[PDB]
Amino acid sequence: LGEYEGERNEVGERHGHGKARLPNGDTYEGSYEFGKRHGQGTYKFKNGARYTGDYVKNKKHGQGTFIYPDGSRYEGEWADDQRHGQGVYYYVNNDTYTGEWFNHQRHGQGTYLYAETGSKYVGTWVHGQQEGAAELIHLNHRYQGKFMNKNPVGPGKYVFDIGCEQHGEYRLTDTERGEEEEEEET
Amino acid sequence: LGEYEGERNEVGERHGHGKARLPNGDTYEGSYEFGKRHGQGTYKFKNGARYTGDYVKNKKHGQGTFIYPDGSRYEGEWADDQRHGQGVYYYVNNDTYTGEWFNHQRHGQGTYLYAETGSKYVGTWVHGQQEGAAELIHLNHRYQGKFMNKNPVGPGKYVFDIGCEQHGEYRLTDTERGEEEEEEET
Amino acid sequence: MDADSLLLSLELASGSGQGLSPDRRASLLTSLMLVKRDYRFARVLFWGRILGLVADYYIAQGLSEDQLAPRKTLYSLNCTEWSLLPPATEEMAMQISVVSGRFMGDPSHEYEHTEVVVQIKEETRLVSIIDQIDKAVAIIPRGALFKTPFGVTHVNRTFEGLPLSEVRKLSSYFHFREALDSLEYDIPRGSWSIQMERGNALVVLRSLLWPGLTFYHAPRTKNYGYIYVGTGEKNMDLPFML
Amino acid sequence: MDADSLLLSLELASGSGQGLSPDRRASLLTSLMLVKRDYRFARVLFWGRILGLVADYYIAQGLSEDQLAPRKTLYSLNCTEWSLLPPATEEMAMQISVVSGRFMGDPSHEYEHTEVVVQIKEETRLVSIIDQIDKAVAIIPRGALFKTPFGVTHVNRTFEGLPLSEVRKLSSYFHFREALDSLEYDIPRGSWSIQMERGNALVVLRSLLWPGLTFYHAPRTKNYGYIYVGTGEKNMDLPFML
Amino acid sequence: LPAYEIAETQKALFLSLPNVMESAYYFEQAGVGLGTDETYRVFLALKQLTDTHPIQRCRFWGKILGLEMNYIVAEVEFRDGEDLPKSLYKAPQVIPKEESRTGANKYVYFVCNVPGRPWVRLPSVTPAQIVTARKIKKFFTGRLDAAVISYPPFPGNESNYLRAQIARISAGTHVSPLGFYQFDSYEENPDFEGIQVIDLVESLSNWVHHVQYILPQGRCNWFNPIQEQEVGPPLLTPISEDLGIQNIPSWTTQLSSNLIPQYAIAVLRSNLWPGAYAFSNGKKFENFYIGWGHKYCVENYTPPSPPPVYQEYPSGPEITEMNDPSVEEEQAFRMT
Amino acid sequence: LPAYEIAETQKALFLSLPNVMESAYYFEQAGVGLGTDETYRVFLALKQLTDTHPIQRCRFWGKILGLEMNYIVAEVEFRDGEDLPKSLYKAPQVIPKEESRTGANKYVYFVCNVPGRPWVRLPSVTPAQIVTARKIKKFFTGRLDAAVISYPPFPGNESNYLRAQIARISAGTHVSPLGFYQFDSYEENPDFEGIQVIDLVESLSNWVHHVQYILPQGRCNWFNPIQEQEVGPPLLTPISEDLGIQNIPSWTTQLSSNLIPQYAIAVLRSNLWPGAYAFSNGKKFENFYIGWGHKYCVENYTPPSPPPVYQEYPSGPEITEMNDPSVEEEQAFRMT
């Protein structure tokens, strides 16, 4: 059971920028507004995780950067201890996912940039998975099509920097694709 | 010795058509004039030779046919027991020399035709030898040139059936001659 | 190819990979004249060679009048025997879109497809591939077929070659088929390999849409010709490779 | 033969035996245009290959403007280093009348000529033999060379082949020398072998004054070209052979 | 003019290595290769390369076709002289090259465009980033400095991709008849006692591989990168068990000069790699490749699937944080 | 058109014999031959010749040139089935042929004008007025029935002059490099063990004549025409002591590679017969004549000398005679 040091009120909560030691081994340097945990502050766990940002409605809400203990991090908007709003995630392989988040999962419009490859998955994410109406933009081409269960299965077209595009259908196997319908730029 | 089963009309010597047998074995069937061998007569030798011809002034003179014992024969003009005038000689290889003779030798415009080969030498002969101003006609061409020491040595021309002549100069030997200046028919 | 002076028109021409041989050279030199004698053709040229799996095809294209009709196509397992091929239509051109395998090289071999079980002949797919090639990547130099007021445009005898200022220009080469003719404004705009083999004496245009087609042309002498020693596949990964 | 892309006319082509070879075709193909770069030549023709005794000569002739003229001649044992021959005249043609042997492969070979121990050169005999061949049996078809009003007698581009009525006869073949130029009026009037090797596609005129000279021509295209692969001896036994 | 410039640089040609002309004559009969005017220029290019480098044997590997200029390839072999917790994801076991002359770098491949131009030596290929990047398919523009791009970041400037394609062709299609290269390294059999040309046509098992197959790891020999264990067809195996689809055979066999039975050379054409030919008559052989350096697929080539996205940190007992202590816990800790 | 009627008879070509193709690539390297398509045309003409005649060993002899049409000659051998006094000056010893397959007619020479037209078999030449007529040189017309004539009476219609020129060329320009065709008859040496090419270049004592030599009497053996013998160089003698003009070497020996000493073929050439060539790359060999069927001398061709004129009979005692058996002796023979 840790003990708080700093300022405290006579009837209410601490109500000031103070550092509190959690009984499980965490250090929270932050403020408290309206008798609850509210405002900017830095939470720090015992394994190496961190969270520098705002606390609204007793949880992580507002602008904030979380540092996960596996090496990943996530900056941006937070809501009720879930990832929601505009956010940029940096994974262990420096994969930069910037875009919308909803309820601790990838949802809405997002841009997943591979660091070891160089490709940007720009499009819709449902329940933290790659979904349809998305484009894999590379340094040589860009594939506009539908993605199901982290794979391309629907009809899609590859647009190239040379000035031409080609349509095509993906088969039932993931590593199979039949191509036709080559035109110029629209 | 000799016997004569003919006729002796004149009181001096024999006269008329008579058949005399010579003491060595020759038989002469022919006429006589001026007490001597004259006119047409056939003189047959004992070795196989023959002569059917004219005897004028103690000798062979006029038209005659001599069958030589080696197989050859001669039909032509005789003079003083010598071949002189136009005559055709059939040699032992069926060669026909239809030319002029003078004193038992070829002399004049002879026409020595080869039978085993096919060539024809129309040219001047002295002493039974080839001389200049001669035409050697072959199956394909005719050589107008000179002849000395049984070989052509002078610069002569060659007339061909294709319609061209060439003026070649014969060297000191019959082998390795010179030839140039192929011309057109004049 | 061409009909006369078949030595400079190489089957290889330092291009297209494979080619013919001195087993198929003299037989083709007599066979083009035999096809020109049998069928009433104005000009006859060797089109190209399909690879196959058991034998080649040795495709020769016999040209009729007006130089624009669907001219005749001839295949041959052996170069002494030659047969006909029907003129291609649109339905046989769209029926081959479901099959993408290699050529077999057998006239009795049929390709099966489950749509009810259906089968298609190898020869109709072959003449459909040949019609697609001659309607897609068949090229001629500039001025090789001059415009006629009667509308025939058979052979331009004025054209002796292209000058040195327009050899590398891709837009100079027209097409043999109808869209005077259509120039090189194709859909990938990078599907041609223009190379200079021996100085400025021979330009080689290799087709990148159909791998195996070499079009040789001399700039000074009127000697142009295309030969397809490809396998007839229509690889749709062309801008993936460009 | 021809200026560029020499493989349109085969050097052998089943004509009078020997022609060119590997180790010699690409070497002369580079060397002709190298001479055209070095010397101010409009065209350059591979004149022929005189056999010699220990080495070949590989004679190449260089064309220029103002044709029907004494042209430049080059010989080379190895086809990398080349040397120019002096212009020939009638004095060396008179001087070679005493020799009737064949050429030595070693250049600048000495001759005895015992009559005086004066010696003649091999290069002047070579260029005199080339002048004697080129003025007599070097032939040109009807539509190749034409008389210009200015007098440059340049090569006409409108050749249009040669019809059937004048491919077998000798009335259509001109000469390089003048009497525009003299046609086939040779002195035995039978000194030319006229043959059809591969059908009506290649007419071949082989010389009989010199048994190594061969002239290829096509009745359709521009394949005219002469080449002397022989010895250069002037054998005067031609009516004896005819 | 560029014609005189390309003619004057060929003067060094007209001034150990396997006979190329004989092979060319056989390949020409086979119906592959180059015509007999440029395949002699590459022979003199190989002769110029042999006289400038200590080469034990210099073979004509073939000619890779290109966009602006082709890639004429040599295959040489030198005798003695040659040329709080942060960042928990490291490099995924970057594998270096095997050795100098043992693995996939057993033969140095010199590549030139024109034989008048000097040879450009290709660098030694590495398995982990160039050979395992065989899932791409790109053309060649004939520049060797164009820095071609694909879906993975290629560590090459068109020399490394050409070297990887040449290694794939020489490891998958360089074949020899049965009886050659007995037993790692291999030495030629003195007791070869010939072979029949007809037996090399009806029987595909008489063509051994004689070269090490490229593994999916990239190198030809496993080296235990963890301190898994994959191996394909080993050395000296026939081509009757090559991997491929069921309706297209792996290798086809035709006979050059078919009309004459007595003098016919077996020709091997690789279905997998267009432009690759092997010719045998009974005593000698030579492998060859020409055309685009590409592998044939039954369907059209599709780009590979992307790697799966990394999952985030799961909701466990460690990610759950205590919000605020109770009033009794903060008012009773000072007493108890 | 002539092309249609020559294609309709050349179509039968493409529809126990020599390896024409192998021996033609090396001849093309030497610079002699027909070409690329015409050589395969005459090779398929040889193939059409072998299955229509019982031939155990054919050989492409060559191509003797003509005026309007040429001659392609094949040298084949069959197994068992093949095709007042009188005139004192008699016939000058007419010598018949030796045999059908042993002497100068050991080889059967088939002749076609083009590969399309069928072959015409040349008859067995008589060595009395045709082979001994080597003192002529005539251009070949190209019809085989033109009835060519010369200075000697020729009993031929160009089908015998062609066979005589073939027997003249083949007897002197068919060479073997000292190793095989050992001991008349000759068979191939089993332990030939190869030979060096440059030793055949720098030395002329290697190429020996395996065929019999044509005597000045016309034959190859001796017939003894009286019921001393005329002989020349026997079998297997080198061409270093070949007959001819002493100022001109009888054989030109060149190495037609000049760059690669590794692989090259000795390229022999006859100076007596312009157009005869021969290659031997160390193990294989071939001879090949082409061009006009004629010989070469240091001077031009002269016609032969006329025979002696057979001088007439001399006038002796058998020609001359006495005058007359007159009266002065017949009047004394009565009393005697």
Flag whether C76 is in a domain.
Answer: yes
Phi, psi dihedrals of residue A151, rounded to the nearest 5° = -145, 155
**Residue A80 · residue A71 · CB < 8 Å:** no
Distance CA F75, CA F20 (A): 12
Distance CA E190, CA E182 (A): 10
CB contact under 8 A, D34 and E36: no
The dihedral over CA atoms of D98, D104, D110, D112, expressed in degrees to the nearest 10, equals: -40
**Could you tell me the residue range of the domain that residue C77 belongs to?**
25-241
D-chain residues near C201 (CB < 8 A): 4-5
The dihedral of CA C226, C231, C234, C239: what is its sign? negative
Closest CB to C241: pick one of E2, E68, E138: E138
Structure obtained using = cryo-EM
Distance CA E217, CA E194 (A): 37
Helix (H/G/I), strand (E/B), else coil: C126: helix
A-chain residues near E84 (CB < 8 A): 47-48, 69
**Residue B41 · residue B55 · CB < 8 Å:** yes
Residue E81, burial from CB neighbour count under 10 angstroms (0-12, 13-18, 19+): exposed
Flag whether D167 is in a domain.
Answer: yes
Distance CA E286, CA E170 (A): 12
* SS3 per residue for chain D: CCCCCHHHCCCCCCCCCCCCCCCCHHHHHHHHHHHHHHCCCCCEEEEECCCCCCCCCCEEEECCCCCCCCCEEEECCCCCCCEECCCCCHHHHHHHHHCCCCCCCCCCCCCCCCCCCCCCCHHHHHHHHHHHHHCCCCEECCCCECCCCCCCCCECCCCCCCCHHHCCCCCCCEECCCCCCCECCCCCCCCEEEEECCCCCCEEEEECCCCCEEEEECCCCCCCEEEECCCCCCCCCHHHHC
CB contact under 8 A, F84 and B94: no
Q: Which residue has the tokens 């061009």?
A: F291
Flag whether C17 is in a domain.
Answer: no
According to DSSP, the residues that pair with A158 across neighbouring strands are A143, A166
D21 and chain E in contact, CB less than 8 A:
no
Tokens of residue A50, six digits: 């961190």
DSSP B25-90: S-EEEEEEETTEEEEEEEEE-SSS-EEEEEEETTEEEEEEEEE-TTS-EEEEEEETTEEEEEEEEE
CB contact under 8 A, D5 and C33: no
Measured CA angle at A43 (ends A41, A45), to 5 deg: 175
- Selected for mutation to probe chain D from E9, E14, E23, E117 (highest D CB count within 10 Å) is E14
Region class of E181: left (phi > 0), else alpha (psi between -120 and 50), else beta: left
Measured CA angle at E220 (ends E217, E221), to 5 deg: 90
Distance CA B135, CA B145 (A): 7
Residue E334's CB: how many other CB atoms inside 10 A? 7
The dihedral of CA F324, F330, F331, F336: what is its sign? positive
CB contact under 8 A, E67 and C193: yes
Residue F145 CA: distances (Å) to CA of E205, F20, F134, F190: 58, 29, 20, 44
Tell me which H or E stretch contains C37.
Answer: helix C25-38
Q: Measured between alpha carbons, how far apart are the two ends of chain C, in Å?
A: 28
Instruction: Indicate the length of chain B as a whole number.
Output: 186
C237 and chain A in contact, CB less than 8 A:
yes
Nearest C-alpha of chain C: how many angstroms from F48?
15
Residue F10, burial from CB neighbour count under 10 angstroms (0-12, 13-18, 19+): buried
Helix (H/G/I), strand (E/B), else coil: A71: coil
A140 contacts: CB under 8 Å, gap ≥ 6: A160, A161, E149, E150, E151
C179 contacts: CB under 8 Å, gap ≥ 6: none
Nearest C-alpha of chain C: how many angstroms from A114?
20
Tell me, yes or no, whether chains C and A touch by having 3 or more C-beta pairs under 8 A: yes
Distance CA E264, CA E267 (A): 9
Half-sphere exposure of C90 (CA within 13 A, CB side): 0
Residue A21 CA: distances (Å) to CA of A4, A10, E102: 6, 20, 63
Q: Which residue has the tokens 């030919």?
A: E277
Tokens of residue E203, six digits: 């029987």
Measured CA angle at A103 (ends A97, A106), to 5 deg: 25
Helix (H/G/I), strand (E/B), else coil: C239: helix
Tokens of residue E305, six digits: 């699937």
The CA-based diameter of chain B, rounded to the nearest angstrom, is 75
Relative orientation angle of helices F38-50 and F2-14, to the nearest 10 degrees: 50
Query: Which residue on chain B is closest to F308 by alpha carbon?
Result: B150
Distance CA E327, CA C31 (A): 106
**Residue F272 · residue F244 · CB < 8 Å:** yes
Q: Which of residues 182-201 of C touch E (CB under 8 A)?
A: 193-201
Tokens of residue E238, six digits: 């026939």
Q: Using DSSP bridges, classify how beta strands E59-64 and E285-290 pair: parallel, antiparallel or unpaired.
A: parallel
Phi, psi dihedrals of residue E81, rounded to the nearest 5° = -105, 125
Domain boundaries along the sequence of chain E: 1-308
Q: Note the Cα E263 to chain centre separation in Å.
A: 33
DSSP C42-93: SEEEEEE----SSS---EEEEE-GGGTS--EEE--SSTT-----PPP-HHHH
Region class of E151: left (phi > 0), else alpha (psi between -120 and 50), else beta: alpha
Distance CA C227, CA C20 (A): 11
Instruction: Indicate the length of chain E as a whole number.
Output: 336
Output b/e per residue, F39-59; b: 16+ Cβ within 10 A. Answer: bbbbbbbbbbbbeebebeebb
CB contact under 8 A, E21 and F263: yes
Measured CA angle at D114 (ends B178, D233), to 5 deg: 40
CB contact under 8 A, C26 and F21: no
Flag whether C116 is in a domain.
Answer: yes
C-alpha R_g of chain F = 27
Q: Measured between alpha carbons, how far apart are the two ends of chain F, in Å?
A: 103
Instruction: Indicate the residue type of A76.
Output: G
CB contact under 8 A, E309 and A112: yes
According to DSSP, the residues that pair with E118 across neighbouring strands are none
Region class of A138: left (phi > 0), else alpha (psi between -120 and 50), else beta: beta
Tell me, yes or no, whether chains A and D touch by having 3 or more C-beta pairs under 8 A: no
Closest CB to D187: pick one of B158, B168, B184: B184
* SS3 per residue for chain E: CHHHHHHHHHHHCCCCCCCCHHHHHHHHHHCECCCCCCCCHHHHHHHHHHCCCCECCCEEEEEECCCCCCEEEEEECECCCCCCCCCCCCCCCCCCCCCCCCCCCCCECEEECCCCCCCEECCCCCHHHHHCCCCCCCCCCCCCCCCCCCCCCCCCCCHHHHHHHHHHHHHHCCCEECCCCECCCCECCCCCCCCCCCHHHHCHHHEECCCCCCCCCCCCCCCCCCCCCCCCCCCCCEHHHCCCCCCCCCEEEEECCCCCCCCCCEEEEECCCCCEEEEECCCCEEEEEECCCCCCCCCCCCCCCCCCCCCCCCCCCCCCCCCCCCHHHHHHCCCC
The dihedral of CA C158, C162, C163, C165: what is its sign? positive
**Residue E37 · residue D11 · CB < 8 Å:** no
DSSP A95-123: -EEEEEE-SSSEEEEEEEE-TTT--EEEE
Tell me, yes or no, whether chains D and C touch by having 3 or more C-beta pairs under 8 A: yes
- Selected for mutation to probe chain A from E309, E310, E315 (highest A CB count within 10 Å) is E309
- For chains C and E, count residue pairs whose Cβ atoms are closer than 8 Å: 124
Nearest C-alpha of chain D: how many angstroms from C75?
24
Tokens of residue D55, six digits: 């080495």
CB contact under 8 A, A164 and C97: no
The dihedral over CA atoms of A150, A153, A154, A155, expressed in degrees to the nearest 10, equals: 120
Q: Which residue has the tokens 């720090």?
A: A44
Residue C44's CB: how many other CB atoms inside 10 A? 24
Q: Which residue has the tokens 């190449």?
A: D60
Nearest C-alpha of chain B: how many angstroms from D47?
25
Region class of A88: left (phi > 0), else alpha (psi between -120 and 50), else beta: beta
CB contact under 8 A, D17 and F290: yes
Distance CA F75, CA F61 (A): 5
Closest CB to D218: pick one of C4, C33, C198: C4
**Residue D216 · residue D198 · CB < 8 Å:** no
Residue F306 CA: distances (Å) to CA of D177, F114, F326: 42, 39, 49
According to DSSP, the residues that pair with B42 across neighbouring strands are B29, B52
Distance CA C11, CA D131 (A): 39
B49 contacts: CB under 8 Å, gap ≥ 6: B66, B67, B68, B69, F318, F319
E187 contacts: CB under 8 Å, gap ≥ 6: E181
Declared resolution, Å: 3.2
Tokens of residue A149, six digits: 């269960």
E16 and chain F in contact, CB less than 8 A:
yes
Q: Using DSSP bridges, classify how beta strands C110-114 and C72-74 pair: parallel, antiparallel or unpaired.
A: unpaired
C108 contacts: CB under 8 Å, gap ≥ 6: none
The dihedral of CA D150, D153, D157, D158: what is its sign? positive
Residue F318 CA: distances (Å) to CA of A162, B42, F312: 120, 16, 14
List the one residue out of E174, E249, E250, E168 whose CA is nearest residue E215: E168
Tokens of residue F197, six digits: 């090419």
Nearest C-alpha of chain F: how many angstroms from D148?
35
Distance CA B113, CA B118 (A): 7
Nearest C-alpha of chain C: how many angstroms from A131?
24
Tell me which H or E stretch contains A170.
Answer: strand A164-170
**Residue F10 · residue F41 · CB < 8 Å:** yes
Helix (H/G/I), strand (E/B), else coil: C221: coil
**Residue C180 · residue C174 · CB < 8 Å:** yes
Closest CB to D4: pick one of C3, C7, C201: C201
Distance CA E290, CA E70 (A): 10
Query: Which residue on chain E is closest to D26 by alpha carbon?
Result: E37
Flag whether D1 is in a domain.
Answer: no
Nearest C-alpha of chain A: how many angstroms from C186?
9
Tell me which H or E stretch contains C29.
Answer: helix C25-38
Distance CA C196, CA D237 (A): 50
Helix (H/G/I), strand (E/B), else coil: C28: helix
* SS3 per residue for chain F: CHHHHHHHHHHHHHCCCCCHHHHHHHHHHHCCCCCCCHHHHHHHHHHHHHCCCCECCCCEEEEECCCCCCEEEEEECECCCCCCCCCCCCCCCCCCCCCCCCCCCCCEEEEECCCCCCCEECCCCCCCCCCCCCCCCCCCCCCCCCCCCCCCCCCCCCHHHHHHHHHHHHCCCCEEECCCCECCCCECCCCCCCCCHHHHHHCCCCEEECCCCCCCCCCCCCCCCCCCCCCCCCCCCEHHHCCCCCCCCCEEEEECCCCCCCCCCEEEEECCCCCCEEEECCCCEEEEEECCCCCCCCCCCCCCCCCCCCCCCCCCCCCCCCCCCCHHHHCCCCCC
F194 and chain E in contact, CB less than 8 A:
no
Region class of E197: left (phi > 0), else alpha (psi between -120 and 50), else beta: alpha
The CA-based diameter of chain F, rounded to the nearest angstrom, is 113
- For chains D and F, count residue pairs whose Cβ atoms are closer than 8 Å: 125
List the one residue out of D209, D134, D144 whose CA is nearest residue D173: D144
C-chain residues near A179 (CB < 8 A): 236-237
Helices H / strands E in chain C, number of each: 4, 11
**Residue E269 · residue E31 · CB < 8 Å:** no
Query: Which residue on chain C is closest to A161 by alpha carbon?
Result: C239
CB contact under 8 A, C34 and F11: yes
Distance CA B42, CA B51 (A): 6
Tokens of residue C136, six digits: 């897609």
Closest CB to E257: pick one of F21, F260, F262: F21
CB contact under 8 A, B179 and D237: yes
**Residue C99 · residue C120 · CB < 8 Å:** yes
The dihedral of CA D34, D39, D40, D42: what is its sign? negative
- Selected for mutation to probe chain F from C8, C30, C78 (highest F CB count within 10 Å) is C30
Helix (H/G/I), strand (E/B), else coil: B3: strand
Distance CA E92, CA E89 (A): 8
Q: Note the Cα C156 to chain centre separation in Å.
A: 20
Query: Which residue on chain B is closest to F326 by alpha carbon?
Result: B13
Query: Which residue on chain D is closest to F249 by alpha carbon?
Result: D53
CB contact under 8 A, F299 and D100: yes
Half-sphere exposure of D166 (CA within 13 A, CB side): 13
CB contact under 8 A, F307 and B69: no
F-chain residues near B162 (CB < 8 A): none
Domain count for chain D, please give it.
Answer: 1
- Selected for mutation to probe chain D from B138, B169, B179 (highest D CB count within 10 Å) is B179
Instruction: Indicate the residue type of F325.
Output: P
